[PDB]
Symmetry: D3
Subunit: 308 residues, 6 copies
């Protein structure tokens, strides 16, 4: 009575998850109508079932968000026992506060929408701010890429015992100090004032830029130059969410990165074809395991510091 | 105390409404971030004000819906006294029942999202099903294009007194009989055999007017027009309140035998009127502006029905 | 842990349902106090149980509605695992819109009342408008009489392959075309302007008036005359809900119907005694089966086009 | 800005209230359809108005309750600014606890239905249990008949200074001690042995006044009166705020030894006063009208307590 | 999958309950931060578990209430299957109405807080007013001390067949008549006007003052004098909740009580050390049994008139 | 129409606010019953009024929180038009995430309790995390001490133009870079090795100003000051908006090398300034009073940011 459904035609990650659980993805008719309205029909009974819907990897976020909400709704009114939204990269997470401005908190609205659509549980990876768990009243499991990142560092960078973990911004300090302490190495922080400042020593060390996401990549690219200017041996960037919109791929191809490392929370295949610096960490096992534990009532806490 | 804001790049209807009320549209930045995420910034204080957000006309339904919800949210947490969503064409209204499938009721989800976003009131025109009003617990005013459609028929069709109001499908029966009763004329109905088309009612030697709440790809309305011609209708008109016209619609209309296709201003038509000569629009900005002023003043809105 | 309860002293339908499930109806003290207030007490534990309450067949709708709400409430606060309202004929369904008027949407209020009383699930047959499912946030199963109606037609009307399915009003068009297409026959539509108009051919054919309900029967009786005037061979009327209030029974006894066919969503025994034209389709098996499937997490979709 | 509407055929209390406020009752059609379903139609715009619906006095509790809820709903979706339910006698108030049974708390269900219907405020008189106020999250004003009952006792009973205020049962203890303390007089209590009746307190050679929130079949109050007579009470009175008087109540009172039975105007009594001479009514329309005006004006309503 | 947790360091009652169920109390870090903020961490997984949290016996009610709410919250967002608040003595129960005053109904706010914190079920003993069950929408089990009180009376007071059960106030009448009828004895009632009045005969009989709680004990102490003045042979006081704040212990030591009997809904050990008149009825078995039944879907109604 | 009430025995901030608005504090009895239960009684009618409750300064966080919630509840069921909670230092704000533990989000629970109590609006100062605003669905105005802190630095520190704004931990990075950018000065950060302290950034031969949202036991801030001294900082200041100062805090500060510790008026400091000479307070009553007046009048509150 566990049922996994995928969004749109980006089965990629959701197929890996379903594979790892020994399951076929449930039958869904999932497209757009002529007037661009989202079209969904659940192709099998979900009555009394433990349902998991994995958010599509299309790229048009509002389409994918609506598709997800519509799928949640269809399953809830079709008498699913429980519906869990598996949202590897949480949409609108960077709008999680007003910022001294007359702005929306779109991440709270998104939480409210998921809730009224009928979500009983959220599974996500590396929320932009941990406080977003509090934007819901339903339980959220915020998985970490940290264990898989630590693992990637230790087996891919020889100098890891003498590297510096660097935040590209002021907001990422906690995350980098946390990784630096686990590895027992130094940390540094970049802050943009339209000019960057670096605090911390990177001289004659490998520098690893660590952030939760990379979008247009303006920031990591400038930070990498800054670090080389400060005497870093070579620069890596490791993000969980590889968004890479706009000129990101052009920017990465022209930057001084040894490698840009991301998870597959977002589909990366097409971006990798035009960008050889990108390497992907498969996190499908961490997601599959969290679903399996969720379903069985077993500890998901294991995953926060352990790689399956 | 009153503030009107518009969604994104379409401002034409919103401007017309603001004009009729002696107001400038509120300043707002409505864009998309690099990654396609909707960006909204309310450019002025809305604290203690009666706010009206008029839904955009920028085609991408999900972007327009998210933009609307975000605007509502931003206004509500910025201490607006009241927030009304003015949504001329209600999105997802055709998904208002399961229809024997394991389907979503997307129109109820939309109602729930608008409500949780913080809408206190909905103003809309010709809901696909009048029951959608009950998908909310907040008040909805469902305005009708009918009086204006009635006006247009009497004013533009010379043989209107001996005409037939035709429904493109089985579902639109009540809509056309209402119009046929008002004009004291005949009605007829078309149905697709579940496909061949069947017509019930007399259209021979008389002007046939196809009436429906909306026309999308216009496949139904264009096939219906052929069938009405074969049945000996003098000339065929198509009158829809919501002119979506997506996909092959414009090419289909031009190839069809329509004397005229009449739509309201609920969706922008300017772009489509340029490539389709037989389209005429009824301006409905006065109905909407008048519902906003009357909503704000506590005056009767039923007069407009 | 399935428990069926019945409303008031009209056990009739609910006893048939309980019979078909191999169950006795749960013990309820269910009456009115002296001041006409509804009196309910659940005579056995419902703690952790899957509870089904079938709406009474009394006739005083507000009494029956309140009784149902009170029973739902008593079971919810008595720690029932789930409470399902089995409402064969949904009250106030004809007040499902404003109708250009300053009117209530009583069907939405009724939905809101059921929800706040503690209903987790609704089972009903042939909602007056399918959009009423959207008046709830909880799952609703809207069963169809269509399969049993098609079955009744094919085995009771010899001329069924050459009949016309007729809507008594403009609102019933979809329903009749749907039945006409399945049978592969013609459809027609009556519309009242205080004068009726018929569109569609009924000449020298059996006419079957098909609607969701028959109340005072003014409309079906006038439509039957109209159809005979248009050359119909004989007229049948088949409704799911036989309300038959006011002068309906007198009206049917004086009309030109071959037969008036209804379901037992409403008790019909007393009405049949004073009206020989009425025949009943037993739908207790469709209801019993939907409860059994609901309880077991099995497909209720089977019932929408299949007769058990 | 203020509108008072009445429930169904009983308009007497509602008229008295509307009179005291210089208003006509709002026009509304309150009927039943052929199949017993409650029909309601608000005959005028309530948009932006402060609406008060006064619960009917047409006996059938479930019809009256549904009529009230439907009226509230119709007003709320018709964009009333605020809707207050004025419910002199709160329905289902005696079902306010489980009482060791697998029973409903019907009074909470009623509170929940009123709230979901869209009531913003409740005005009522002498709730069976004062805790019912907490069955809502909306404000409730619970008015008391006590000051008017006190007035009536002093005004109509000559030996009131040496009288005893008697409770018909164990539950009504706090109600009678409150009244006995206010008049500086004795109290006593009756209890049914779980039946024989037991009396605690002195009533010998003094006027006994039975006080309770309500009298329904009047079996308790009539048996209590007999027991009070056997205990040597000079004369026995019965004073209840809510005079339901269902079933054999009227015949029971006439056969009983009551000097007078006093009730308020919370339920219509005119019909019953014709067949029962000893019933007197305290008009409470002024208390209710005054709570409505004060609710509307933001003035103190506690003065009326 | 039953898990019992206790509040603060007053494991006392909760340990007895856990003992009787064959369980160890779940691991909780439960204290105050330096700024007096409540500190909680659930020391084990509660995912998919049936969770019971027993309210602490500290004495600082607002601390204990917040601790409970915080524990409920932590368990709910940690994916507990169900969370039940076991609140032997319900806080703020004496603020269950306005009382002709511009007062809060704090007991309703407390109910609303428990509900929004994530409580699915309440287990309590002898609510100050039964109407407080209606302050919730979730099921409440209001257990009675009555069976254990009747038992205590019959085996500790020889003259029980000829005693008088006395209410210390007007509000306790129903409770005492109920006990008096079961025992088949007389009842009496005290009412404070700043002077007490007694109605009912206590002359040459054992008088038992019965109330739901004893706080400062001003009222029971004055009532006991009054009863002796009226000719009672000896006076007992039996309350379910022994609060005994302020000068209660001094007051009881100086009063004419044969004995003051309370339950262990509140810890009593320290109070008994300074007051020899106090005897305790252990109600841990009634609570343990209600939890066990709750968990198993078995009848809790048994406990309302039966002692396990 | 406006009413300001204060929580319990601390009235100093509340008086200052009421003074600035030309008002007396509303009469309210805020005590504890014998058994430690919070007692509240609203001493006047709040019916139809815009009510502001200013959170107490009586140290016991749970008593103060319950007192606030009870006051809100009493006002809401007493038919206040609107209830705003003015909470200078938001309780449980540090518990705003799970932080890898099976922990509560106590700040969300608090948000939910305030909301269910009946708060319509929150006014607070320097939320520990700005995301706490989204723990509500009601509007929150999050005021900043920053402009006043900026003023104090320029006004009281002579070498401010060549100074360094230092963060006591990793988390406070964004707070100090904001201040360093505004003054056009350097920033630095301290981190505890997970313990030895590490400093990143230049502080040698320049005045170092430790800035944080709050200081509790002051262990972090005092150890940070030592490390800043060892790194050759001329003089060290500590500036916090919320000066909790619990436990050994006062003794720690006196033993530390601080030139001055600056806090706002969000928590009472009078008692602590008597035993700690280096503490200076910025009065923030004008910011709060001004947000209340502007909230009430519908005027811009963003001006104060
Ligand atoms: N999809 C997006 N792409 C780029 N920037 C965004 C997006 N959503 C929000 N923002 C902005 O990013 C900032 C969030 O700050 P932080 O959370 O500290 O990175 C805010 O100023 C937002 O306006
Ligand atoms: N945006 C849309 N475009 C085309 N068809 C739709 C859309 N939304 C819903 N539908 C379908 O339209 C069909 C008929 O709707 P109706 O005319 O209301 O009976 C249903 O089967 C829906 O699945
Ligand atoms: N119980 C009832 N009996 C008769 N008519 C009703 C009832 N409830 C609602 N109506 C009316 O029936 C009409 C519903 O239209 P329709 O849904 O198209 O049949 C509305 O005008 C209602 O006022
Ligand atoms: N309308 C009613 N008529 C008669 N008795 C009722 C009514 N509603 C509830 N009751 C019962 O009255 C009894 C006593 O109520 P109370 O006086 O509040 O203790 C309870 O056992 C209820 O079941
Ligand atoms: N913790 C408490 N201690 C003492 N008295 C209280 C407490 N809580 C509420 N009260 C008061 O006790 C009375 C409750 O009345 P009753 O419920 O009849 O005992 C009210 O006047 C309350 O103000
Ligand atoms: N009142 C409090 N006093 C001390 N520490 C707290 C308090 N509330 C939460 N914390 C802890 O403070 C730590 C750091 O919070 P933050 O500075 O937001 O990362 C977390 O691990 C919390 O458990």
């Amino acid at each position: 009575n566990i049922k996994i459904f995928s969004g749109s035609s980006h089965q990629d990650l959701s197929q890996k998850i379903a594979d790892r659980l020994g399951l076929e993805l449930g039958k869904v008719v999932t497209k757009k109508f002529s007037n661009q309205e989202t079209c969904v029909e659940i192709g099998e009974s979900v009555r009394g079932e433990d349902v998991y819907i994995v958010q599509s990897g299309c790229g048009e976020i509002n389409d994918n968000l609506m598709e997800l909400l519509i799928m949640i709704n269809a399953c809830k009114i079709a008498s699913a026992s429980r519906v869990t939204a598996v949202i590897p990269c949480f949409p609108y997470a960077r709008q999680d506060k007003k910022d001294k401005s007359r702005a929306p908190i779109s991440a709270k609205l998104v939480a409210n929408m998921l809730s009224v659509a009928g979500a009983d549980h959220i599974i996500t990876m590396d929320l932009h701010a941990s406080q977003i768990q509090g934007f819901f009243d339903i339980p959220v499991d915020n998985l970490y890429a940290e264990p898989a990142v630590l693992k990637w560092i230790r087996e891919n960078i020889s100098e890891w015992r003498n590297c510096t973990i660097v935040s590209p911004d002021a907001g990422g300090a906690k995350r980098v100090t946390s990784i630096a302490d686990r590895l027992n190495v130094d940390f540094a922080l970049i802050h943009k004032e339209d000019r960057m400042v670096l605090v911390g020593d990177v001289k004659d060390r490998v520098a690893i830029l660590v952030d939760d996401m990379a979008d247009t990549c303006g920031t990591i690219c400038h930070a990498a130059d800054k670090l080389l200017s400060a005497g870093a041996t070579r620069v890596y960037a490791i993000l969980t969410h590889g968004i890479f919109s706009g000129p990101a791929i052009s920017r990465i191809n022209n930057a001084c990165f040894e490698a840009v490392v991301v998870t597959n929370t977002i589909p990366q295949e097409d971006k990798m074809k035009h960008c050889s610096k990108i390497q992907v960490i498969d996190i499908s096992m961490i997601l599959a395991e969290a679903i399996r534990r969720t379903h069985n009532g077993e500890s998901v806490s294991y995953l926060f510091s352990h790689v399956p």
